[PDB]
Design a protein around this ligand. Structure first.
Ligand SMILES: OC[C@H]1O[C@H](OC[C@H]2O[C@@H](O)[C@@H](O)[C@@H](O)[C@@H]2O)[C@@H](O)[C@@H](O)[C@@H]1O
Ligand SMILES: [Ca+2]
Ligand SMILES: [Ca+2]
Length: 410
């Protein structure tokens, strides 16, 4: 194996090298390129990756700096995050309408939220601030036209009604909105965020995307079947995001119901996604060549989000941290690929490097996921997410409410 992770010093060094290798995929800080995105989209034959994955990358680097103290990439990341905000400072840039799903917008919002929680340096005074960007995403997601009576509520996957998939009310869209609301409640101490988060979680439970018996977390259902045609694929990031938001709700509310939800979601995740201590993407990983570019990034979110759960729901620490350690050990074991001797693949549990070309990408998601897993080994040494008591970001009471905002011509 190339990377060492047995001590704090070794983990820092490994994370710094992993941060370098992941950055090689990113061209957006170079002359003539677009900040904030990885190469793509594949629909234009520009590269393998969609817009939302750029937002995921930004958040991974906000976390990297928080966990390691290394600010080397902070300028590049601030530039990327700011470039993609759109004219209404809401992460709805219209050039990206095809990529405008509530989830895609949500991931950008979550990265802004993370920047506020982590005290990431503020943008210039005349630019949108991190908390305000998170508030704008949440506000647009709470807008009445996104909450119709079909399936008794819930967000649709897509924002534009003409986007393919507008008829799919899926877990990830709702989980993003839930997680933002829970996080905004904790940061701002404003209970209206929390009331929305409660409502959306209760909807996910009622519609049966959360299994009442096992606490498995399914993918979604379609409005023309009243959401009853549940797609029971279990993607790791769905359960993990609900766990993350539930942990923020437990920390904010101190309500035993939320502690029980954390515990039940966590039991399910350990049962379903961790295979002898290693995270495993159950709908696709069992054979090579099935995971999409998006799926290759999920395990990295699992690691980062579960690590934060241990800070804000500290009773979970002993269930989570040993398992994240075994999973990260497997991640680095297989980061041995040519031509560098340290290239990372996806198939951690297998114990073997598999070239990312088997899944038809250059390998940025796998690189991101290992970076996430290794960095998050430092969670014990990191500060917990800040609230407005110690944060440095600023909000906006009219975030998401501009008169030129897209909701005004829906
Ligand atoms: O990969 C599982 C995932 O697949 C579909 O959404 C894929 C992917 O689309 C991107 O554009 C972005 O929206 C991202 O969040 C999403 O993962 C969909 O069927 C979804 O429900 C499912 O979880
Ligand atoms: Ca999308
Ligand atoms: Ca490709």
């Amino acid at each position: 194996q190339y990377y060492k992770i047995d001590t704090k010093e070794e983990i820092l060094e490994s994370a710094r090298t992993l941060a370098y290798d992941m950055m090689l995929f990113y061209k957006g800080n170079q002359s003539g390129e677009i900040p904030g995105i990885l190469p793509g989209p594949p629909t234009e034959h520009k590269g393998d990756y969609y817009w939302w994955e750029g937002g995921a990358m930004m958040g991974t680097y906000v976390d990297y700096w928080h966990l390691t103290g290394d600010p080397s990439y902070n300028h590049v990341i601030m530039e990327g995050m700011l470039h993609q905000v759109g004219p209404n400072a809401d992460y709805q840039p219209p050039n990206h309408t095809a990529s405008l799903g509530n989830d895609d917008q949500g991931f950008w919002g979550m990265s802004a939220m993370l920047a506020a929680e982590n005290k990431f340096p503020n943008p210039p005074d005349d630019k949108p601030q991190w908390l305000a960007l998170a508030q704008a995403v949440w506000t647009t997601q709470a807008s009445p036209e996104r909450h119709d009576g079909t399936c008794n509520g819930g967000l649709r996957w897509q924002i534009p009604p003409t986007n393919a998939g507008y008829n799919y009310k899926n877990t990830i869209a709702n989980a993003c909105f839930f997680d933002l609301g829970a996080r905004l409640a904790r940061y701002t101490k404003n209970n209206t965020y929390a009331e929305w988060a409660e409502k959306i979680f209760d909807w996910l439970y009622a519609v049966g995307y959360i299994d009442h018996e096992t606490w498995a977390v399914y993918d979604g259902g379609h409005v023309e079947h009243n959401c009853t045609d549940i797609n029971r694929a279990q993607f790791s990031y769905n359960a993990a995001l609900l766990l993350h938001g539930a942990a923020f709700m437990w920390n904010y509310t101190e309500d035993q119901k939320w502690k029980d939800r954390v515990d039940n979601l966590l039991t399910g995740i350990l049962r379903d996604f961790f295979k002898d201590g290693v995270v495993f993407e159950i709908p696709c990983e069992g054979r090579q060549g099935a995971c999409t570019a998006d799926m290759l990034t999920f395990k990295g979110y699992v690691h980062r989000w579960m690590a934060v759960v241990t800070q804000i729901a500290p009773h979970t620490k002993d269930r989570i941290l040993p398992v994240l350690r075994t999973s990260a050990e497997a991640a680095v074991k297989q980061c041995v690929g040519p031509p560098t001797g340290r290239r990372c693949g996806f198939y951690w549990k297998s114990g073997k490097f598999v070239d990312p070309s088997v899944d038809h990408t250059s390998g940025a998601g796998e690189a991101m996921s290992v970076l996430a897993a290794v960095s998050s080994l430092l969670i014990e040494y990191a500060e917990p997410p800040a609230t407005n008591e110690t944060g440095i970001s600023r909000g906006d009471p009219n975030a998401g409410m501009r008169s030129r905002g897209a909701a005004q011509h829906f």
